[PDB]
Short mmCIF file of C-alpha atoms in Angstrom, two decimals:
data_model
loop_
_atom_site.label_atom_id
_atom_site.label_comp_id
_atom_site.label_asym_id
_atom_site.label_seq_id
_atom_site.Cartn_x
_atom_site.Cartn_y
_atom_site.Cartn_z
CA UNK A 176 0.00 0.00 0.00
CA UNK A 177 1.93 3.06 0.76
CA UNK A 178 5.42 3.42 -0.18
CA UNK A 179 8.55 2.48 2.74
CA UNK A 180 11.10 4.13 0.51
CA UNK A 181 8.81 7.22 -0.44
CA UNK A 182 7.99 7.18 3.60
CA UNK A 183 11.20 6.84 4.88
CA UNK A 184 13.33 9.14 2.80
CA UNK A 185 10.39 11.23 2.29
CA UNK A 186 12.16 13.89 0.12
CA UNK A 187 11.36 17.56 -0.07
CA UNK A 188 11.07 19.53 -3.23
CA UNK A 189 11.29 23.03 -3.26
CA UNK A 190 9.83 25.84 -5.88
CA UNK A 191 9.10 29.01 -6.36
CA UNK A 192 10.44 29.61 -2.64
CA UNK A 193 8.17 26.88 -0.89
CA UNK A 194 8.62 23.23 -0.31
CA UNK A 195 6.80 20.24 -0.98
CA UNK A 196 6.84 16.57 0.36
CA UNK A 197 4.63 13.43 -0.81
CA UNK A 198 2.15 14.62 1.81
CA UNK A 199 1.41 17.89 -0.98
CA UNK A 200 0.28 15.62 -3.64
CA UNK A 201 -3.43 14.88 -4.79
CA UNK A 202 -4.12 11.28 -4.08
CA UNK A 203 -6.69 9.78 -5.48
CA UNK A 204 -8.84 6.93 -4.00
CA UNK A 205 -8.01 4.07 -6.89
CA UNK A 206 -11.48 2.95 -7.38
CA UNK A 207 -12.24 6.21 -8.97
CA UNK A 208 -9.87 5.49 -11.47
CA UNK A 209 -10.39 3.37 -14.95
CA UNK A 210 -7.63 2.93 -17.35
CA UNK A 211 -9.43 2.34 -21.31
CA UNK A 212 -6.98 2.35 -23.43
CA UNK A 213 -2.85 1.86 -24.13
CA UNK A 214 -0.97 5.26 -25.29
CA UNK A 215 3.02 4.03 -25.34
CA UNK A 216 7.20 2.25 -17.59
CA UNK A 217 4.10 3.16 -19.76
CA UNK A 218 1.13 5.49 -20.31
CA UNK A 219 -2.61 4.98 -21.03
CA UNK A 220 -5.97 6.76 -21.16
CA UNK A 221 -7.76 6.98 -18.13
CA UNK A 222 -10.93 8.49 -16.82
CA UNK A 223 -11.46 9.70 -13.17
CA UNK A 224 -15.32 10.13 -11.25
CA UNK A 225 -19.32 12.52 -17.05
CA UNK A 226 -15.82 11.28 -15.68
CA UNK A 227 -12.77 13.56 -16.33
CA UNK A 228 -10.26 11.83 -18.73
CA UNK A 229 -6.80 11.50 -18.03
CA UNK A 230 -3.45 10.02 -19.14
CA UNK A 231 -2.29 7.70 -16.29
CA UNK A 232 1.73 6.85 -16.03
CA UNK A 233 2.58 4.06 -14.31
CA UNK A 234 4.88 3.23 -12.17
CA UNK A 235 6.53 -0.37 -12.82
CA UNK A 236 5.71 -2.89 -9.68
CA UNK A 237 9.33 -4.24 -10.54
CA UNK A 238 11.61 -1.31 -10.08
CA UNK A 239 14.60 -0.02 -7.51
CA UNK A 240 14.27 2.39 -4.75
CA UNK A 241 16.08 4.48 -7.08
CA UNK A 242 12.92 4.29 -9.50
CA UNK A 243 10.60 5.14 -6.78
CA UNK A 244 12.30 8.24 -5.32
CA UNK A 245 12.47 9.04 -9.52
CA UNK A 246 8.63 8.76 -9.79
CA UNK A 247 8.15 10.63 -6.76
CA UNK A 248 9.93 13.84 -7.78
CA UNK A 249 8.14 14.20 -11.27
CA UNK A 250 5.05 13.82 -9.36
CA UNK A 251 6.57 16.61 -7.29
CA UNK A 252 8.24 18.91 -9.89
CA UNK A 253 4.65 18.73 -11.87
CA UNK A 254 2.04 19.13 -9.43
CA UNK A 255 3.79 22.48 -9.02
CA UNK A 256 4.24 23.90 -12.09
CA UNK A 257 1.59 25.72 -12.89
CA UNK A 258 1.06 27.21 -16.54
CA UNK A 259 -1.40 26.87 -19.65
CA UNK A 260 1.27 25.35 -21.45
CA UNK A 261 2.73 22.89 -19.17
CA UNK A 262 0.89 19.76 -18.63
CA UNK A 263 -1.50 19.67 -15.85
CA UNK A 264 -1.24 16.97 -12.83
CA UNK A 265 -4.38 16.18 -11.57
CA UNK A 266 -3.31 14.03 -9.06
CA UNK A 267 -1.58 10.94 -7.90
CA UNK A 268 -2.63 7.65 -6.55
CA UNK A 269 0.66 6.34 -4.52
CA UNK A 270 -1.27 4.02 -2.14
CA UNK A 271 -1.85 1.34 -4.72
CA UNK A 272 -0.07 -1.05 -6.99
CA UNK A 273 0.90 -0.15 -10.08
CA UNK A 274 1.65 3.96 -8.30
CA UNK A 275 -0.13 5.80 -11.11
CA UNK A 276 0.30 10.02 -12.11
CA UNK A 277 -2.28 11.46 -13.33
CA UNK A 278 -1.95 13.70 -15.90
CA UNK A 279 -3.87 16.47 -18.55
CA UNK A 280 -4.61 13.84 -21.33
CA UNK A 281 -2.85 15.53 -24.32
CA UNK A 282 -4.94 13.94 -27.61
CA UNK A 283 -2.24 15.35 -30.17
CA UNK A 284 0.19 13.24 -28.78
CA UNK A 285 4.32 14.17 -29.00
CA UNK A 286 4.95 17.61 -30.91
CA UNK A 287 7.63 15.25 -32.77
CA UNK A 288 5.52 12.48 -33.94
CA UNK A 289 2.52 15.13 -34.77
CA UNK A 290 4.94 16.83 -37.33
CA UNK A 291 6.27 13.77 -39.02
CA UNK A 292 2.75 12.39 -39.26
CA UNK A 293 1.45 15.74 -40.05
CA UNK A 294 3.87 17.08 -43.18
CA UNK A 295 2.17 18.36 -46.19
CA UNK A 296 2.18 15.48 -48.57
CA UNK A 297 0.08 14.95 -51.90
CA UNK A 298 -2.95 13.09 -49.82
CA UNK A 299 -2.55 16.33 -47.45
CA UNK A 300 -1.04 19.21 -49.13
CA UNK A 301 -2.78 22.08 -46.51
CA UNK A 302 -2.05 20.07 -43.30
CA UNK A 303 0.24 22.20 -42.03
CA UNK A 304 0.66 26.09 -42.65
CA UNK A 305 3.58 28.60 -41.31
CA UNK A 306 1.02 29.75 -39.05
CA UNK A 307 0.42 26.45 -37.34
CA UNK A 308 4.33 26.21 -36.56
CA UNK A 309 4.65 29.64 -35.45
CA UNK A 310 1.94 29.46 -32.86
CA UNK A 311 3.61 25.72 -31.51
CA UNK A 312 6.58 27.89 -30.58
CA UNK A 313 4.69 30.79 -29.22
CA UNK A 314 3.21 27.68 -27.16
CA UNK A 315 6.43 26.06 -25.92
CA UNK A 316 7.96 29.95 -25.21
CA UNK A 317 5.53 30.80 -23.46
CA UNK A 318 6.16 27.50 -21.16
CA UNK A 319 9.40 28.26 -21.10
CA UNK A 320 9.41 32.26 -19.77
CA UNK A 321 7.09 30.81 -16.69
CA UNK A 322 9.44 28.34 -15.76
CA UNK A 323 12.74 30.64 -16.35
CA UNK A 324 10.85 33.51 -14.39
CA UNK A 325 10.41 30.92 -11.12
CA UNK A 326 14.03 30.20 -12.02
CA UNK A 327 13.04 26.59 -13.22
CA UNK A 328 15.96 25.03 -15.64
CA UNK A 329 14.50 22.38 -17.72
CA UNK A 330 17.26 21.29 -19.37
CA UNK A 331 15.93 18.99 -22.32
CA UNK A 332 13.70 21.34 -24.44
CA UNK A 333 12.97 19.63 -27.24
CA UNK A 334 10.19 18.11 -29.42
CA UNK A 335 10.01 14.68 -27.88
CA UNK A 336 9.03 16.26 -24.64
CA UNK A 337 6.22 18.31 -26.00
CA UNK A 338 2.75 17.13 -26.25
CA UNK A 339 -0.64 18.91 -28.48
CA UNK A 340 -4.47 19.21 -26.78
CA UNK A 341 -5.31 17.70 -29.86
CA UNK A 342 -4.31 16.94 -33.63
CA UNK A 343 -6.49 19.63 -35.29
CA UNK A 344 -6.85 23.06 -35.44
CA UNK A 345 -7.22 25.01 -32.25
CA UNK A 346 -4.16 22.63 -30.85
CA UNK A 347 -2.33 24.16 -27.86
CA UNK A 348 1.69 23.30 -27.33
CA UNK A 349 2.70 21.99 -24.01
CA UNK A 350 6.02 21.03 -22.39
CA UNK A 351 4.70 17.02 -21.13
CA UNK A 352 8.08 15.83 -19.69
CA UNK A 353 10.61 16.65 -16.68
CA UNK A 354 12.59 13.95 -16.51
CA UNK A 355 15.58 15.40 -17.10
CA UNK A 356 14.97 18.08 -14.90
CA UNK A 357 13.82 15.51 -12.07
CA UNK A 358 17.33 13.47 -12.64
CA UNK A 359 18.97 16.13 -11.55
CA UNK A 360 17.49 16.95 -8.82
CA UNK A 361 17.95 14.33 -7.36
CA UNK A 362 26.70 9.80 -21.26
CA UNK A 363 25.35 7.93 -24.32
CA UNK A 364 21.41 9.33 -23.23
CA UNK A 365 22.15 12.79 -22.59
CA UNK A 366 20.35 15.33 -24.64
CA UNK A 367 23.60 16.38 -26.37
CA UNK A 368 22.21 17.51 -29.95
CA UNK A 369 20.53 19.74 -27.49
CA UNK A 370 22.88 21.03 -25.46
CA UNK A 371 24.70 24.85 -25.44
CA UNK A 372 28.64 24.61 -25.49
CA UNK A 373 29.33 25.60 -21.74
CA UNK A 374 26.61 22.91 -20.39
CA UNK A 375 28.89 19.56 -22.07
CA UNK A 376 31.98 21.17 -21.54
CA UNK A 377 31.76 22.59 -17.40
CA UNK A 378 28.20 21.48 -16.74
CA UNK A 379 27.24 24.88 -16.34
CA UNK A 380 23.51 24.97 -16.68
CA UNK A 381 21.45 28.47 -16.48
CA UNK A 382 18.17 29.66 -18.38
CA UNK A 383 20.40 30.42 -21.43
CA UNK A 384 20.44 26.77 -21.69
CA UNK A 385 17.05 26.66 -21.85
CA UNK A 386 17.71 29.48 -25.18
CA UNK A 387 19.69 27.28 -26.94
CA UNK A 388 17.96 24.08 -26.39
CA UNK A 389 14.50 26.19 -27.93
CA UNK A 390 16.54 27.30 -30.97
CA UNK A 391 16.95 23.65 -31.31
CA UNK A 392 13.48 22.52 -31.16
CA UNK A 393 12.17 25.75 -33.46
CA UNK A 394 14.52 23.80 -35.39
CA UNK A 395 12.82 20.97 -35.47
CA UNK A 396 9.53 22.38 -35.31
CA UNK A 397 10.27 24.24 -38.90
CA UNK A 398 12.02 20.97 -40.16
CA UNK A 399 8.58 19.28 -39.88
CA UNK A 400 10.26 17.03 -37.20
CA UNK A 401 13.82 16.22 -38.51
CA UNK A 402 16.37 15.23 -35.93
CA UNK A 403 19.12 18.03 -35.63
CA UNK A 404 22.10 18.14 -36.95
CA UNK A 405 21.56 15.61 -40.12
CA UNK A 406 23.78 12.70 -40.47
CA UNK A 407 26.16 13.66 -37.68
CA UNK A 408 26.55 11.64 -34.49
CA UNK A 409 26.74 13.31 -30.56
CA UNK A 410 30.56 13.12 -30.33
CA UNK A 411 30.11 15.01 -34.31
CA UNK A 412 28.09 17.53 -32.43
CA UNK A 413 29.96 18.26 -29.79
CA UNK A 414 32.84 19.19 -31.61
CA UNK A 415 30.72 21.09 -34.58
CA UNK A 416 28.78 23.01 -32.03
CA UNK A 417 31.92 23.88 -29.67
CA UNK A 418 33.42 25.11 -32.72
CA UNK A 419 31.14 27.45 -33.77
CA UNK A 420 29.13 25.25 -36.16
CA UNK A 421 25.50 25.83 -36.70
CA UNK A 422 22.85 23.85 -38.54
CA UNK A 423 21.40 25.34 -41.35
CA UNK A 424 17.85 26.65 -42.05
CA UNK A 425 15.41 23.80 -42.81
CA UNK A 426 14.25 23.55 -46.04
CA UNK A 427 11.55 27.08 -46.66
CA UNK A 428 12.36 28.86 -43.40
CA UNK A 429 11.57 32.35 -43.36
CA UNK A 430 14.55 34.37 -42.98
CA UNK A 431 13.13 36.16 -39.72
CA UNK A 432 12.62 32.66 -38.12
CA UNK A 433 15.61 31.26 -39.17
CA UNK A 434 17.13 34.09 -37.40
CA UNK A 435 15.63 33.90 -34.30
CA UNK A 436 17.33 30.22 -34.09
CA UNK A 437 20.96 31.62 -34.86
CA UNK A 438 19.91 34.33 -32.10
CA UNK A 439 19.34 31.24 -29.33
CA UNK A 440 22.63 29.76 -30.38
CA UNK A 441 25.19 32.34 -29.36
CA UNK A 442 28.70 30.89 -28.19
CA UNK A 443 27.97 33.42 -24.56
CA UNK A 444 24.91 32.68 -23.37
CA UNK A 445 25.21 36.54 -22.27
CA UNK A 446 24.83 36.83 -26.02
CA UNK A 447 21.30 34.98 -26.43
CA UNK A 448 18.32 36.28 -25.66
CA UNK A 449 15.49 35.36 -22.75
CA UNK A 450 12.10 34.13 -23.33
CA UNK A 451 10.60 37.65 -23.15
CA UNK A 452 12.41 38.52 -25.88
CA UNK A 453 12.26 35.15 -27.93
CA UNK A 454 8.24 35.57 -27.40
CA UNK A 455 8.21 39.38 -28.84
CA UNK A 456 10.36 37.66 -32.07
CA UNK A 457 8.25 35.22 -32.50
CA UNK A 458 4.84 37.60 -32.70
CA UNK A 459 6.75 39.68 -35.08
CA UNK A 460 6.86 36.55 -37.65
CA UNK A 461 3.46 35.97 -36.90
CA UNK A 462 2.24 39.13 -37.96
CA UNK A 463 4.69 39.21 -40.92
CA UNK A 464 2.42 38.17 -44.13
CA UNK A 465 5.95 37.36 -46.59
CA UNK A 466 6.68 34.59 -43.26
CA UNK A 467 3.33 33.29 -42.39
CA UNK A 468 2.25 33.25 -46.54
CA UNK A 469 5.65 31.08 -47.06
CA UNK A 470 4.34 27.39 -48.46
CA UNK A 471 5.76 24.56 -46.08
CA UNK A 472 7.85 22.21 -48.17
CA UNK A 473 5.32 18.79 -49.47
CA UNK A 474 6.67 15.72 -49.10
CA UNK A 475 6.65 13.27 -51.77
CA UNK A 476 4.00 10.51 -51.03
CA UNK A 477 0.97 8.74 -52.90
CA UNK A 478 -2.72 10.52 -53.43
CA UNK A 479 -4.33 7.69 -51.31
#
């Protein structure tokens, strides 16, 4: 039932100037919860008592202390954030086996598997528009200025870890996951395509790592989902990026966009600008008609 390890070391988070234990979080009684459906330990749709839907993570029954404690702080770092653009918590249920989060349900699924599935092709040549793009980064900047003005560092923005409301039109951008945030608060995997020079080099991390991690995933937001830096490998990146090497535009960038990338990527992060300023960029494009009246690129495919 409840948790020894979560009990006995009983960690604190703090945010924002105020601190949070396992006591903080919403639990909710487990027979008010009903898991439907399998979404990709793992995540389905759930609804909680018309019931409220949610997307339930689970914690795996076979895991270490280690993996507790993990599950524990995300449950933690989320049910404190608290933005329109980052994923809501609406509770927990820690007393019962699997431990479930429960989470905002985010229909769209992954901002990177949503572009890829989503390109203009000849079956769906208006899919996508400029417009569409630019507002997903508005989205995810906006996410980002809340958490670096509560002096949050998320360290791993990129598209993977955002999620949509919902495929279609009227979609809203969210940032969905903190793990990396929650590993170190408490490498082959790290985020290194990602990463500003100083962070792989001294493990520095400030908010201007946050910057340069964004220019990354507008990036791959106006790539149509593209990993970074094509064909080369981490170590490749590494040494590109610490010499001064910058990916180029994706294919029909705007100039103004493009720029706002190159911007995010300054060698000093004194150099790059905050989200305040990436957010006033970014409405400038929007309200530019040569940007937002640029054609996405249409990827070769069948009619039906």
């Amino acid at each position: 039932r409840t948790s020894t390890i979560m009990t006995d070391y009983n960690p604190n988070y703090s945010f924002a100037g105020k601190t949070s234990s396992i006591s903080d979080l919403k639990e909710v009684p487990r027979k008010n919860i009903t898991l439907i459906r399998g979404l990709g330990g793992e995540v389905y749709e759930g609804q909680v008592s018309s019931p409220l839907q949610v997307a339930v993570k689970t914690l795996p029954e076979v895991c270490s202390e280690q993996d507790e404690l993990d599950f524990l702080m995300e449950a933690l770092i989320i049910s404190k954030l608290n933005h329109q653009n980052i994923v809501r918590c609406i509770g927990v249920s820690l007393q019962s086996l699997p431990r479930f989060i429960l989470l905002e349900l985010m229909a769209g699924g992954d901002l990177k598997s949503f572009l890829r599935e989503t390109r203009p092709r000849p079956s769906q040549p208006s899919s996508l528009a400029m417009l569409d793009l630019l507002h997903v980064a508005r989205d995810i900047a906006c996410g980002c200025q809340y958490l670096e003005e509560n002096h949050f560092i998320h360290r791993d923005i990129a598209a993977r870890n955002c999620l949509l409301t919902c495929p279609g039109p009227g979609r809203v951008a969210k940032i969905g996951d903190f793990g990396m945030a929650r590993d170190i608060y408490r490498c082959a995997m790290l985020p290194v395509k990602w990463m500003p020079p100083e962070a792989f080099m001294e493990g520095i991390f400030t908010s201007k790592t946050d910057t340069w991690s964004f220019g990354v995933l507008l990036w791959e937001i106006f790539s149509l989902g593209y990993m970074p830096y094509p064909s080369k490998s981490n170590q490749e990146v590494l040494e590109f990026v610490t010499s001064g090497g910058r990916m180029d535009p994706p294919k029909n960038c705007p100039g103004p966009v493009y720029r706002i990338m190159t911007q995010c990527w300054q060698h000093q992060p004194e150099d790059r600008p905050n989200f305040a300023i990436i957010l006033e960029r970014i409405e400038y494009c929007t309200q530019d008609p040569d940007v937002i009246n640029t054609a996405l690129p249409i990827e070769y495919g069948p009619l039906v």
